[PDB]
From Swiss-Prot, chain A:
Name listed for the protein in its UniProt record: DNA-directed RNA polymerase subunit gamma
Role according to the record: DNA-dependent RNA polymerase catalyzes the transcription of DNA into RNA using the four ribonucleoside triphosphates as substrates.
Family: Belongs to the RNA polymerase beta' chain family. RpoC1 subfamily.
Subunit structure, interactors included: In cyanobacteria the RNAP catalytic core is composed of 2 alpha, 1 beta, 1 beta', 1 gamma and 1 omega subunit. When a sigma factor is associated with the core the holoenzyme is formed, which can initiate transcription.
UniProtKB/Swiss-Prot annotation, chain B:
Protein name listed in UniProt: DNA-directed RNA polymerase subunit omega
Enzyme class: transferase
Domain of life: Bacteria
Family of the protein in this entry: Belongs to the RNA polymerase subunit omega family.
UniProt keyword annotations, A-Z: DNA-directed RNA polymerase, Nucleotidyltransferase, Transcription, Transferase
Native organism: Synechocystis sp. (strain ATCC 27184 / PCC 6803 / Kazusa)
Primary role: Promotes RNA polymerase assembly. Latches the N- and C-terminal regions of the beta' subunit thereby facilitating its interaction with the beta and alpha subunits.
Parent-protein start and end of this portion: 11 to 68 of 76
Catalytic activity: RNA(n) + a ribonucleoside 5'-triphosphate = RNA(n+1) + diphosphate
Curated annotation (Swiss-Prot), chain C:
Secretion signal, residue range per the UniProt entry: none
Superkingdom of this protein's organism: Bacteria
Gene of this entry: rpoC2
Lineage, top ranks: Bacteria, Bacillati, Cyanobacteriota, Cyanophyceae, Synechococcales
Organism, as annotated: Synechocystis sp. (strain ATCC 27184 / PCC 6803 / Kazusa)
Residues of the full protein shown: 1 to 43 of 1317
Protein family membership: Belongs to the RNA polymerase beta' chain family. RpoC2 subfamily.
Protein purpose: DNA-dependent RNA polymerase catalyzes the transcription of DNA into RNA using the four ribonucleoside triphosphates as substrates.
Name this polypeptide is given: DNA-directed RNA polymerase subunit beta'
Subunit and interaction comment: In cyanobacteria the RNAP catalytic core is composed of 2 alpha, 1 beta, 1 beta', 1 gamma and 1 omega subunit. When a sigma factor is associated with the core the holoenzyme is formed, which can initiate transcription.
Amino acid sequence: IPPDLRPMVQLDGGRFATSDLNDLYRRVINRNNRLARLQEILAPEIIVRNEKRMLQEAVDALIDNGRRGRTVVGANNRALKSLSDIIEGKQGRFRQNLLGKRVDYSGRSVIVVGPNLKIYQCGLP
Amino acid sequence: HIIYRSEELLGAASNRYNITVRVAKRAKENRSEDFDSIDDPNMKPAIRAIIEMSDELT
Amino acid sequence: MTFYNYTIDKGRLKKLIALAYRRYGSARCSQLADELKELGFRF
């Protein structure tokens, strides 16, 4: 994904506000560089078989977290946001950013009853 | 009397979604023709397109 | 014009609003409901 769709900003206290896509992308490359390291030094086959199984679980948790195996977590004990979990839910990209948007030139207030007026006329402060 | 002029325009037209495009396409001509220093605050170009279209309807 | 010589309820008011739509349209029907609520708020 492009990096602006996984933004990394810094807060006022100095901490960084990372996304869950950066933690799932890093699990793929860390297990892919280990597989290229084990295949170069002629590792035992019980370690290469276990490394390819974790590479299969890293991509599947990146695409749909919690579909086949167990749901991976991060620092907080909530579920990580995968690539598929941002489009299917009620808080996904379809039902919260495409079918319904927050508009400009808008506002709200409480309403009171206006008598001595007409229809097609409203009181505006 | 603007709401009485709009009900006469929507009637005898057979398509209420087509005669409102001709009002919106005439208000842009009245806005470009009113580019001089004289600007009437009471007669908007969107309101003047409804009065001029109802006078030619008869 | 007709003369309504009976006591007016809510259901008899909706027949008057529906009769003004069939004969006069929407502009005169909204003016009738605008004047009927000045009469109700006063009395």
